[PDB]
């Protein structure tokens, strides 16, 4: 009941569209720099 | 060569002396101070997760 009709986009009035959530799936590749040792720097009696 | 038996029997008192050695050396305080090596450790930081900046108006 208004001028602006047939416009492409998505207004903020009701974005949820009655849905609890919008979901997305994917893969997650991380190349972080751990502090982890290499089993050295550990005392000489490092054993059962 | 029989002298070894005589020496053992005669010197048996050193057995009790050695028992004292070990059972009071244990009592005495020792601390082997394992090091940190020449290479030094360090943790990341105190890091806490939060929601990022929000564009309010």
Q: What is the DSSP string of B24-51?
A: HHTTS---------SSPP----------
What's the reported resolution, in angstroms, to a tenth?
Answer: 3.5
Query: What is the 3-state composition of chain A as percent helix, strand, coil, each rounded to the nearest 5?
Result: 0, 0, 100
- Identify the residue among B31, B33, B37 best suited for mutation to test binding to A, counting A beta carbons within 10 A and taking the highest: B37
Q: Quick check: A37 and B36 in contact, CB under 8 A?
A: no
- First-to-last alpha carbon distance for chain B, in angstroms, is 105
CA distance B40 to chain A (A): 10
Q: Any CB–CB contact under 8 A between A9 and chain B? A: no
Query: What is the 3-state composition of chain B as percent helix, strand, coil, each rounded to the nearest 5?
Result: 40, 0, 60
Q: Quick check: B55 and A47 in contact, CB under 8 A?
A: no
- Residues belonging to chain A: 48
Sorted by sequence, the CB contacts under 8 Å of residue A43 that are 6+ apart come out as B34
Q: Any CB–CB contact under 8 A between A34 and chain B? A: no
Experimental method: cryo-EM
Q: How many Å apart are CA A46 and CA A39, to the nearest integer?
A: 10
The tokens for B47 are: 């890091």
């Amino acid at each position: 009941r208004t001028r602006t009709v047939n416009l492409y986009g998505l207004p903020a009035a009701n974005p949820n569209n009655g849905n609890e959530y919008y979901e997305i799936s994917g893969r997650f590749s991380l190349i972080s720099l751990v502090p982890t040792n290499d089993d050295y720097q550990t005392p000489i009696m490092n054993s059962v | 060569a029989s002298l070894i038996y005589r020496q053992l029997l005669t010197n048996s008192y050193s057995v009790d002396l050695y028992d004292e050695i070990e059972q009071i050396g244990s009592g005495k305080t020792q601390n082997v101070t394992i090091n940190p090596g020449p290479f030094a450790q360090t943790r990341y930081a105190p890091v806490n997760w939060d929601h990022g900046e929000i564009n309010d108006s």
